[PDB]
Symmetry: D3
Subunit: 156 residues, 6 copies
């Protein structure tokens, strides 16, 4: 009766699409850990990204956020878990991710569960949101309230 999953990504910044995945993971596993990737060139620092996710998931009691580095399967196994949950928008997303999933299962016995993203956000990604905002487009309805204002300031 002690199930759990890791939700990995760069989350730079977290989108409503990502939040939806976290909420859906947290509804089906006893414990969910969001793993924010540290990579040796982002718009937000790892601490900022972690902050934004915490503010948006405060209503999820069984969820926590941490930074991670190195092999994802090492992160997962060091926390006593062996499941990863990720959202997918399209069939080519699946193709990219299936390779990694099968590799992760092979080298460390860690399984991967995919969820279809909510339809209203089939077209949102952190990068497209950032690009559009940079050139003055309105992305307020695609980012959580926590994120949107902080994104404004970053470009200002």
């Amino acid at each position: 009766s002690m199930t759990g999953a890791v939700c990995p990504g760069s989350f730079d910044p977290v989108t409503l699409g990502h939040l939806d995945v976290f909420e859906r993971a947290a509804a089906q596993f006893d414990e969910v850990i969001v793993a924010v990737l540290i990579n040796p060139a982002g718009m937000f620092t790892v601490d900022e990204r972690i902050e934004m996710i915490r503010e948006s998931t405060a209503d999820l009691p069984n969820l926590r956020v941490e930074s991670g580095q190195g092999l994802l399967v090492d992160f997962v196994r060091e926390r006593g878990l062996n499941a990863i949950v990720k959202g997918l928008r399209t069939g080519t997303d699946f193709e990219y991710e299936l390779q990694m999933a099968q590799m992760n299962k092979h080298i460390a016995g860690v399984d991967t569960f995919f969820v279809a993203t909510a339809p209203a956000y089939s077209f949102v990604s952190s990068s497209l949101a950032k690009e559009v905002a940079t050139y003055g487009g309105d992305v307020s309805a695609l980012l959580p309230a926590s994120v949107h204002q902080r994104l404004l300031g970053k470009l200002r």
Copy 2:
């Protein structure tokens, strides 16, 4: 601490690919129910299919098998659950299934978790196994031992 998922399909007959999904589901949820579809023209009767799955999952203590009919989301919700787990082989599998997943979430709040099939069975399906066996090809390594002998008798 009471999580659970439904694994649906026709399973006519169950393959090593399907068994792999069941095992992977049973490792990550407290309760797993395999739902064998009843449809008003199969090679195996629903009771036969149920039998074959039970024989192959006897080492999975938190798994049970039932027949189901009608809307899948009704089956799931009547058992107090709200998650479906299905395997995917390819990106077009994803496309087909994403539609159904989003519809199921919309009409009944039931979520769907997909897993990538084990690589060794990327090409197995119940139908191709049956077709090849019908024309005399050897499909013994693709079906569980329970199924293979029973499939022989069915064509004999």
Copy 3:
């Protein structure tokens, strides 16, 4: 004057279809919605029923009209002095079978096909899936036009 044909079986018309109609009507001087009469496979609604449901939902599009069609689509298109088809695409897989036919239509009759990307909210709906779910009791009121939902429940009973 410019123009396009929006073909389909529309049995029944979905909110996704309506989105396509509106986008076409916004960009072409005239739009004809062509409702396929399939003499082999009949569906849930008669073609007259399908036409009235579409007309109800497109009452505010003065440059769009609705007609039944039969047989080769590119003949229907050409006979009306047009040579463009507008269709929705929900995903990459829609693009695939649709692509072959688009190529065929261009080659056999010089008729162009324009695809538009479905609105995200209704991307998973299809006439077939809406009917299947409704038949077995599911709630599809948010996925179907007002012109359709109540009529749909009636045919099921």
Copy 4:
């Protein structure tokens, strides 16, 4: 020494199919076109007719022969002392369904499958789409082998 089988129902053979035959014949010492018949569902054309259309279009390929068969393709191939199959592909879609059979065929009989990207001009023309379009009067005269076109119109009338 080397050899490949090019299988299909070829009902009728298309320009795409012929492209594949030519490319296979260029790269293997011998090529057998296998016309695979379903003994249960008669197609548009009889086996004799399918073979004659293919032979008429491949008269310039001296290392190619045409034979019919049924049942497991890998048995047809191995009975000829071969163990390669050559087929065309147009899309990622095609590759996905063909990959399954190719992997199965390798698994059960050790038979390899080589895929080739078909020439783009006529790749979209499948046997079924051509028949469908021709059935409803579409002009497919430029889209099919000369050995096929009028024979196809003859059947339809």
Copy 5:
């Protein structure tokens, strides 16, 4: 009255691109080819050069004009009193990445995108692949617009 913008970097324009321009020009009263420049990364050709190659290949399309721009495409489109974009697609792959931008563009500015399946003969020739192949001496003389080919060889040498 009606109008569409056909956007791209066109570095260089391809036969595929030109197919799209022609089809857009056939179905809309006016068409603007938008040559969108990255003010940070200079391509192979300058803006003047990109425009000249396009104009040379579209001299027979009287309702088409060519203009450069930068930044958000939807701003370029709306500043011209338009709200449609026309682009080509070759694969389900293309449609998937373009669907994202199309949906974003509809969301932020109400601008529609119409996709057309490009003519199959030359669909595989992208600007980048042509440049790559030409850079290493591959014969691309039959695969590119006459306004482009020797200009491209000139740049590479």
Copy 6:
């Protein structure tokens, strides 16, 4: 005599690559494995190292030889009196970027490309993913040829 070229960077060669080599060597009279020298992007192993690893793993294929290549692939192929390329495909997405290049190669030089479906067991392996996983400590001994694994661990240290 028949023949084909199996091109790649093979940095390092995988069990998937070896499967392709073996299948090619079984069906063509001669096979040349062409190891790309990329003067811009250097990799983990030198080309001489890559060649010796492949030679070790193909020691029992007498009709296969291994050579370095640079520049346009179809020149390498033609210069050796061949006009066929054999490559592996793992999925529908591999088919997509590979398809464009296959078309290009056929058009600019008349060189055919044959694709073979990867064996299922190793479908998720790629040189890049194997290196990435190995760098960060993961266990890839079952995914790589004997000629490679120990040498790989050496370069990482």
